mmCIF file of all heavy atoms in Angstrom:
data_model
loop_
_atom_site.group_PDB
_atom_site.id
_atom_site.type_symbol
_atom_site.label_atom_id
_atom_site.label_comp_id
_atom_site.label_asym_id
_atom_site.label_seq_id
_atom_site.Cartn_x
_atom_site.Cartn_y
_atom_site.Cartn_z
ATOM 1 N N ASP A 183 85.734 87.070 78.848
ATOM 2 C CA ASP A 183 84.629 86.841 77.941
ATOM 3 C C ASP A 183 84.948 87.668 76.664
ATOM 4 O O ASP A 183 84.452 88.757 76.382
ATOM 5 C CB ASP A 183 83.278 87.327 78.508
ATOM 6 C CG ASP A 183 82.051 86.722 77.893
ATOM 7 O OD1 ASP A 183 82.266 86.008 76.836
ATOM 8 O OD2 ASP A 183 80.963 86.991 78.273
ATOM 9 N N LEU A 184 85.744 86.920 75.785
ATOM 10 C CA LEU A 184 86.417 87.610 74.656
ATOM 11 C C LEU A 184 85.396 88.187 73.654
ATOM 12 O O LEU A 184 85.640 89.290 73.131
ATOM 13 C CB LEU A 184 87.442 86.691 74.042
ATOM 14 C CG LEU A 184 88.526 86.298 75.019
ATOM 15 C CD1 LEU A 184 89.053 84.917 74.528
ATOM 16 C CD2 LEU A 184 89.575 87.371 75.022
ATOM 17 N N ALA A 185 84.401 87.446 73.308
ATOM 18 C CA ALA A 185 83.406 87.915 72.358
ATOM 19 C C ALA A 185 82.802 89.246 72.786
ATOM 20 O O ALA A 185 82.644 90.195 71.994
ATOM 21 C CB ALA A 185 82.386 86.861 72.015
ATOM 22 N N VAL A 186 82.312 89.216 74.081
ATOM 23 C CA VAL A 186 81.683 90.457 74.661
ATOM 24 C C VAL A 186 82.734 91.586 74.713
ATOM 25 O O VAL A 186 82.407 92.802 74.462
ATOM 26 C CB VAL A 186 81.120 90.169 75.993
ATOM 27 C CG1 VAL A 186 80.554 91.410 76.624
ATOM 28 C CG2 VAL A 186 80.035 89.139 75.859
ATOM 29 N N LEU A 187 83.961 91.315 75.137
ATOM 30 C CA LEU A 187 85.046 92.367 75.205
ATOM 31 C C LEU A 187 85.258 92.940 73.873
ATOM 32 O O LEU A 187 85.430 94.191 73.691
ATOM 33 C CB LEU A 187 86.285 91.721 75.782
ATOM 34 C CG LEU A 187 87.439 92.702 76.043
ATOM 35 C CD1 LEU A 187 87.040 93.923 76.873
ATOM 36 C CD2 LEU A 187 88.588 91.899 76.678
ATOM 37 N N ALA A 188 85.392 92.058 72.783
ATOM 38 C CA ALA A 188 85.630 92.625 71.441
ATOM 39 C C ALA A 188 84.546 93.552 70.990
ATOM 40 O O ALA A 188 84.814 94.643 70.561
ATOM 41 C CB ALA A 188 85.757 91.475 70.482
ATOM 42 N N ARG A 189 83.230 93.207 71.240
ATOM 43 C CA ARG A 189 82.084 93.960 70.774
ATOM 44 C C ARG A 189 82.086 95.309 71.602
ATOM 45 O O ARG A 189 81.786 96.366 70.981
ATOM 46 C CB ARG A 189 80.800 93.238 70.960
ATOM 47 C CG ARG A 189 80.647 91.914 70.184
ATOM 48 C CD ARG A 189 79.200 91.525 70.217
ATOM 49 N NE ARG A 189 79.013 90.126 70.744
ATOM 50 C CZ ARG A 189 79.290 89.037 70.005
ATOM 51 N NH1 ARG A 189 79.718 89.107 68.822
ATOM 52 N NH2 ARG A 189 79.075 87.837 70.548
ATOM 53 N N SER A 190 82.300 95.249 72.909
ATOM 54 C CA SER A 190 82.220 96.421 73.670
ATOM 55 C C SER A 190 83.307 97.434 73.396
ATOM 56 O O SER A 190 83.152 98.638 73.417
ATOM 57 C CB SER A 190 82.246 96.016 75.204
ATOM 58 O OG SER A 190 81.129 95.273 75.527
ATOM 59 N N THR A 191 84.545 96.885 73.116
ATOM 60 C CA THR A 191 85.660 97.731 72.773
ATOM 61 C C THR A 191 85.478 98.437 71.424
ATOM 62 O O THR A 191 85.798 99.654 71.297
ATOM 63 C CB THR A 191 86.940 96.947 72.836
ATOM 64 O OG1 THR A 191 87.076 96.303 74.051
ATOM 65 C CG2 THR A 191 88.152 97.792 72.437
ATOM 66 N N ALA A 192 84.935 97.721 70.453
ATOM 67 C CA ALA A 192 84.590 98.419 69.190
ATOM 68 C C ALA A 192 83.582 99.460 69.407
ATOM 69 O O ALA A 192 83.683 100.625 68.784
ATOM 70 C CB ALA A 192 84.090 97.379 68.117
ATOM 71 N N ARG A 193 82.473 99.194 70.123
ATOM 72 C CA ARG A 193 81.497 100.249 70.365
ATOM 73 C C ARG A 193 82.077 101.396 71.078
ATOM 74 O O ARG A 193 81.799 102.598 70.750
ATOM 75 C CB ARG A 193 80.327 99.682 71.207
ATOM 76 C CG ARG A 193 79.104 100.596 71.250
ATOM 77 C CD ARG A 193 78.348 100.561 69.971
ATOM 78 N NE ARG A 193 77.246 101.551 70.039
ATOM 79 C CZ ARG A 193 76.111 101.257 70.637
ATOM 80 N NH1 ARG A 193 75.920 100.095 71.186
ATOM 81 N NH2 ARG A 193 75.118 102.224 70.715
ATOM 82 N N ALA A 194 82.965 101.256 72.042
ATOM 83 C CA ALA A 194 83.633 102.246 72.807
ATOM 84 C C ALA A 194 84.528 103.099 71.901
ATOM 85 O O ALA A 194 84.540 104.334 71.941
ATOM 86 C CB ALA A 194 84.457 101.673 73.981
ATOM 87 N N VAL A 195 85.324 102.480 71.072
ATOM 88 C CA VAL A 195 86.206 103.217 70.206
ATOM 89 C C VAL A 195 85.407 104.176 69.280
ATOM 90 O O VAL A 195 85.788 105.321 69.152
ATOM 91 C CB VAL A 195 87.073 102.233 69.335
ATOM 92 C CG1 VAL A 195 87.775 103.025 68.210
ATOM 93 C CG2 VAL A 195 88.188 101.644 70.190
ATOM 94 N N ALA A 196 84.345 103.616 68.656
ATOM 95 C CA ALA A 196 83.509 104.484 67.846
ATOM 96 C C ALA A 196 82.885 105.648 68.658
ATOM 97 O O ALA A 196 82.830 106.788 68.196
ATOM 98 C CB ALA A 196 82.429 103.685 67.148
ATOM 99 N N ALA A 197 82.422 105.336 69.872
ATOM 100 C CA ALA A 197 81.814 106.416 70.704
ATOM 101 C C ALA A 197 82.844 107.463 71.137
ATOM 102 O O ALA A 197 82.392 108.620 71.380
ATOM 103 C CB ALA A 197 81.162 105.777 71.927
ATOM 104 N N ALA A 198 84.118 107.099 71.191
ATOM 105 C CA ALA A 198 85.061 108.057 71.608
ATOM 106 C C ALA A 198 85.451 109.127 70.548
ATOM 107 O O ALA A 198 86.078 110.166 70.936
ATOM 108 C CB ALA A 198 86.434 107.309 72.078
#
Side-chain angles (χ1 to χ4, degrees):
Chain A
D183 199 354
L184 296 155
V186 175
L187 183 53
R189 301 195 235 280
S190 299
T191 301
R193 191 75 184 280
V195 166

